[PDB]
Design a protein around this ligand. Sequence first.
Ligand SMILES: [K+]
Ligand SMILES: [Mg+2]
Ligand SMILES: [Mg+2]
Ligand SMILES: [Mg+2]
Ligand SMILES: [Mg+2]
Ligand SMILES: [Mg+2]
Ligand SMILES: [Mg+2]
Ligand SMILES: [Mg+2]
Ligand SMILES: [Mg+2]
Ligand SMILES: [Mg+2]
Ligand SMILES: [Mg+2]
Ligand SMILES: [Mg+2]
Ligand SMILES: [Mg+2]
Ligand SMILES: [Mg+2]
Ligand SMILES: [Mg+2]
Ligand SMILES: [Mg+2]
Ligand SMILES: [Mg+2]
Ligand SMILES: [Mg+2]
Ligand SMILES: [Mg+2]
Lengths: 101, 119, 73, 88
Amino acid sequence: MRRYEVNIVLNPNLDQSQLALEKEIIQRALENYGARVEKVEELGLRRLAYPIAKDPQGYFLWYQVEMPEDRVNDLARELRIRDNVRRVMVVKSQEPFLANA
Amino acid sequence: KRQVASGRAYIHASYNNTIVTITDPDGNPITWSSGGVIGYKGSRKGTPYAAQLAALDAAKKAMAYGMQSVDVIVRGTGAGREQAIRALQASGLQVKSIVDDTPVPHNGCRPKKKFRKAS
Amino acid sequence: PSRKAKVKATLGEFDLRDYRNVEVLKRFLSETGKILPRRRTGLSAKEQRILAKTIKRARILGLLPFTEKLVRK
Amino acid sequence: PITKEEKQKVIQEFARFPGDTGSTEVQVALLTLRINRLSEHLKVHKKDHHSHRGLLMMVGQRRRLLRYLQREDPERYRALIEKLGIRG
RNA sequence: GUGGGAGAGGGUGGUGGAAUUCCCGGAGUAGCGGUGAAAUGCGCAGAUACCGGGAGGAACGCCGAUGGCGAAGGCAGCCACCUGGUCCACCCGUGACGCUGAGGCGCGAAAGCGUGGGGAGCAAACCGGAUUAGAUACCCGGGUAGUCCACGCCCUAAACGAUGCGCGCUAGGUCUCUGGGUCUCCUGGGGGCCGAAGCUAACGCGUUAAGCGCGCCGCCUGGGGAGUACGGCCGCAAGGC
Ligand SMILES: [K+]
Ligand SMILES: [Mg+2]
Ligand SMILES: [Mg+2]
Ligand SMILES: [Mg+2]
Ligand SMILES: [Mg+2]
Ligand SMILES: [Mg+2]
Ligand SMILES: [Mg+2]
Ligand SMILES: [Mg+2]
Ligand SMILES: [Mg+2]
Ligand SMILES: [Mg+2]
Ligand SMILES: [Mg+2]
Ligand SMILES: [Mg+2]
Ligand SMILES: [Mg+2]
Ligand SMILES: [Mg+2]
Ligand SMILES: [Mg+2]
Ligand SMILES: [Mg+2]
Ligand SMILES: [Mg+2]
Ligand SMILES: [Mg+2]
Ligand SMILES: [Mg+2]
């Protein structure tokens, strides 16, 4: 397996029932594609730069994971199925690189 | 007949002409003008002077609709784009801000043979 | 031609590889969206080359601006 | 690709004696590994010519080391071939 | 072999925003467009300019360079996956396994051919408008193949560094990309510039040789007739060798 970071930008206009729904769906999909989670950061509502799906805000989540690279791409696809998921950027994680250090 | 009084003025400046549009705060136009609106016919429509008279015509018509203070948006590069903003500042309309919105692609489309050595 | 100081010279010890951090990266952009040149960013060839990709990532994620509008023209 | 313990596992299989990472045997084996991987990747991706070049090269290196081996020790060559299931 | 590295090297799938075109909707009215100046053209069936929504194709601003990678053609949004080449350090392993290379085989810009797709912008041909003594042409408005994709052909070029590949030797200076280091600097590998010696008809080249050598391949032998004729071979043809 290899170590990635899944990025989810969601629809801020969700209340708790529906946020619960999307979370359940996502983490059940990560479970199904064999991605062991490590750290997760929920950054929540943030003011975008340019509007994504007519909306000025976005709901930010960051999941550091590890998984079967041959399947990574498909995971991405499943994660994009929902209407309420506005952006998915999965990047292959790598170590920090510095300046003014 | 709307009595707007707070608005936008989009100056669009080509090489072959100039034209102004004065719109409501939401983007819906109210009045407009251009080098052809005022007298000019041929190339002449893209002069600085044409630009002046144009801009001023629009602003006049706006103050007829009841307009007082406007924000400027400027699209394009042509002689007397700046003169258009000039007649707009000398208009008697209070100009809240000038802003340049001139659109450029991020290398999108093939241009005409005149415009080539770009993409 | 882009003459004052070196965006890096005033900044902490900061990840050039973090697409998620706007407030640092913002300082590497212009009045317009445009990614800043070396003259301003004052980085290394390789540093700049990183900041590029991490910016564009940030953009696609919807954090940094893709383009902007010039004020007071 | 070939990960580290894969490659190693191939060397510790083909090593003429402990610590030999370099012998002609280990080279032909390691090559042969990379080659088979490559042509597998080239079963699909028929359109990828640039990797094919590398393959032509890898292969040439293999045949080169073999012509050395058989010039040298026919016994060990023949054995190395029979053990690799190659040529043909 | 081990351990580090940089990279528009390649192939596949996905995805992003800017712009153009087009359609829908709001508002708005008399022109817009285009040129040296014009006209063809579009516009009261409401155009251009302005806002909002949709669709689709193609390319990828800033970063971007005098940069990088690639054997060459050539390669530029971002992401993942598949994969090639390459550099450095360590001095670990094999033990001359090397170099070149007529045939062969493979790749090979663009245009072009075949069969299906696709088609926004641009556009040979073409349709018009102008300009001139005439205008075919340049300039303007339209526009078809094509440009895009898949699979298969075609094999050309200012396919250029107009400079075959490999190795060894022969002052330096400066700029730079990328490794290692006792990190002003030194060392390796790329990209430029100026110059020893030397070379060169000159221009110029000069540790990225066009210098001093050796190995091997390709090629040259006045100009036109000519990349023509005849013959062969390849090609669906075009045409190529
Ligand atoms: K013939
Ligand atoms: Mg690449
Ligand atoms: Mg008419
Ligand atoms: Mg269409
Ligand atoms: Mg540039
Ligand atoms: Mg690689
Ligand atoms: Mg040793
Ligand atoms: Mg020995
Ligand atoms: Mg070709
Ligand atoms: Mg073609
Ligand atoms: Mg065709
Ligand atoms: Mg056209
Ligand atoms: Mg034309
Ligand atoms: Mg050098
Ligand atoms: Mg150097
Ligand atoms: Mg010189
Ligand atoms: Mg001399
Ligand atoms: Mg003769
Ligand atoms: Mg010929």
